[PDB]
């Protein structure tokens, strides 16, 4: 409950786990997208 | 039995809410009508002196709806700042019962006034709908998110000002009048599409302008948004301000209970 | 943009955790 | 059971920090009513504020395994622009009380103070000694074990003293008193032990007369 | 000498105007110290406000030909965030005293009020006893003939009471004493007659004990 | 003593007390009030300098702004400081010689002296930089300034008396000082205002007084139609009479 | 303009004398 | 322009030190 969220649970559920999953996705899974640019007018 | 601190906090918050309810909208309910007819008093003169100007600036958007979509959020922000500031000094004598912490006064003030402003927003939307104007937002979820971000930003700024200025009584006026220029630089009165471009970047430093533009963009269809206006900047501003205000209250927590 | 996104997310997570911790500390202090 | 463990309390003066209380390891007695005698410029009012949990010690701790009432004082403690009635509702709402006993407490506070229509008037309209009756009634409405009294009954009539004595006798055998005042017959008739503060140090006299004589000279 | 002329006093309340005094005619005896006593919330402070020129009666007047001091009491008469020294300086400048006499009065107040560094601090950070000491010294530093002490001595130590008694005996030949208090020993030891106010009328007891008994019962 | 001597001594003591709080413990306020007008002028040199040169090229912004800023600042200071009186000396009303009118009078003298010093310093430093600084018609400028002084003191006394029952209505009055700074023509010349908007603005006496002061200061400065001294003079006289009479009414309520 | 300039100088001199008298009184009272 | 960048680096370092000191005092007082 309210008087159960120790510093270990707060750090793990708000800092550690999201960073771990996001960095795993970014470094391992995410595919890179090249961008080609042009500048025109009529 | 032990009365766990959440119960004590909620009881103190309810008691403070009931206490400042009398002081906010008058002792005889003479202030509720004032805050009811204040927005219509604003829009009457605003359209009276700017109807043709807004018609030439942009069609397809009625001026009363454009003014309503920017007034009440700004009323929320301004009143949040003011009441959050005055809450700590309003109940100096009440800090004598071991449970009325200074943060509880500002929390109760915010929880009362956001409810009051939501009520008057609902009444204003109903009135606009009764006159045949457009009143239903196209994307209400994003509008609610922007409104929540603005509300929490205003509460954060009010708490920071309350914890800082408390030692300097004459500083309140310095930020009591500073809200009035924000009423003319946030784009609430007039659309920002007519502003000169060279003043655009410096004017974009105001997060309230970004929040107002984002809220308006979620209310009407095909509403264009200025380049460089985003939600990430107000979100970061508000989050950093809330963190800093909470830390500053934590540092000077005992000083505020000097009575 | 991997590393900039990771750094921004790290700062945001740290700020959120600090805000939550300060809020719970403020809540906890109400005693008799 | 109330004990003090290395209290230090100071204030932010322009000329450094004025240490009102240095390191104190005093242990209060038990099952007695204490008279805090002290003198002008001492730390009696600060001690009664600290004992009531009003402000935290700067560099100490006040361990208390007992319920201690808030300091009644002689100034403050009440909300401005409010009647005594709504002040009593606020106080009883802080403690989380049911409506029936809330109204009973309001009735008890109203009947303790010999105040007429002024009870439904703001505290500014009150006299300097009527608010003392209101505060004493509000403090005695609730159930505690150590009532902190800070010169509150110094501005009351003989009827007020008689009423306070009668109600305290009605509360005898279950609660105690910590009274600080400069009226020595009040301390003689109300307190069993004496705690004298001097240069920030608290000393206990088990006899009223010895501490009172140290106070005179 | 101070005489009343059918003066009535009232305050603005939503329920009406409560009459603290209604057509009051009274004549204070001369060459004696007057004990002004009464039940809580019954005159004795509006009376001393009118005696000191604080406010004017709505319908009536107070006629005197004798200088009257300001009504020193438990509050008021001083400005917060202001050093007690410069408050005394402002009071001296109000009466148009010369620079040397102003310095002499400041020194007399400082030596009377046995306060150290706190004498050079704002009056808001003062305990009740030291504020009372400063107020009593300021009142005694001026050459008046009647002094209006509004129970400001209830928060003073034995040292303050002894010093006040000595400083009043120093100039007891010509000056006089109008004192309101709820404690009885000081009234007996200072006053020679008694003035009791009950509802809206004042009554004179040439015997101190008779008036004390009437007020108590 | 004579009542005049008592009033003079009370006013002197109140002025001495008020100077320390208005200025500061270390007199840091002189580092602010002297910096008070400059901070306003500089930003307007970066905003409408070229716009003003297009509007009127005869005069220059560094002098046009000063000729209307410090008089407006002094009017605003009079109104604000006189409105905050009585309360700030509420504890001092305990000596039978300190009356509520004396506090506002002493604050008036203090504000007038401070703003006159600021005006003298500003004119000196404007003449130091080579700008036109000597007034053309000094007597007319002094008369218009005195009329503005009387109007400001009257409004301050009236608001101080009338806000005793309702303190909150005081605060909005301070807020109401902000729009006047934008509508009195201080920042920008009022000749650029569209014709259908001027008659509503003609009801503001501060605009007339500022225009007349600028006309008396600069050589060949034109005055718009409907701008006169009779209307501000009558407004100031009527307001002063009403404020004094209302203070006479509530003479004992404040004390 | 002889009389005009004389009147202007009169007003300026009176104002300057009043302000400097106030300053001198404050200095003399503060300097003890 | 090395001497111009030196002042900016000094300002940045001072601000970082102030923020770090404030947060570490916050942690210490916890
Ligand atoms: N708010 C404050 N800020 C700073 N210093 C204070 C403050 N209140 C009190 N003090 C200082 O601490 C001292 C503590 O005095 P306190 O108010 O406890 O009264 P006391 O000496 O115990 O009793 P009495 O009422 O008889 O004078 C004061 O004399 C003053 O020097
Ligand atoms: N400002 C005021 N507004 C309204 N009523 C007031 C005001 N001041 C005093 N009264 C009332 O006037 C009456 C006279 O009481 P007063 O204020 O003179 O105190 P008192 O009798 O000296 O008090 P005590 O003896 O308890 O010290 C009381 O009923 C009081 O409530
Ligand atoms: Mg005390
Ligand atoms: Mg009284």
Numbering used by the authors:
A (entry chain G): 5 to 46
B (entry chain C): 12 to 270
C (entry chain G), G (entry chain J): 340 to 371
D (entry chain A), E (entry chain B): 1 to 217
F (entry chain D): 14 to 268
H (entry chain H): 340 to 369
What does the paper say about this structure?
CPS secretion is mediated by an ABC transporter containing KpsT and KpsM as its nucleotide-binding domain (NBD) and transmembrane domain, respectively. Cryo-electron microscopy analyses of the KpsMT–KpsE complex in six different states reveal a KpsE-encaged ABC transporter, rigid-body conformational rearrangements of KpsMT during ATP hydrolysis and recognition of a glycolipid inside a membrane-exposed electropositive canyon.
We determined cryo-EM structures of the KpsMT–KpsE complex in two nucleotide-free states (Apo 1 and Apo 2), bound to ADP–AlF4− mimicking an ATP post-hydrolysis state, and in an ATP-complexed conformation after introducing the E151Q Walker B mutation into the active site of KpsT. As expected, in the presence of ATP, the NBDs are closely associated with an Mg–ATP complex bound at each nucleotide-binding site. However, a notable difference exists at the cytosolic entrance to the canyon. The interface helix and the N-terminal segment of TM1 shift by about 5 Å towards TM5 of the opposing KpsM subunit, thereby narrowing the canyon. The KpsMT–KpsE complex is a dimer of two KpsMT subunits, each interacting with four KpsE subunits. Conformational transitions between nucleotide-free, ATP and ADP–AlF4−-bound KpsMT states result from rigid-body movements, with no major structural rearrangements observed within the KpsE cage.
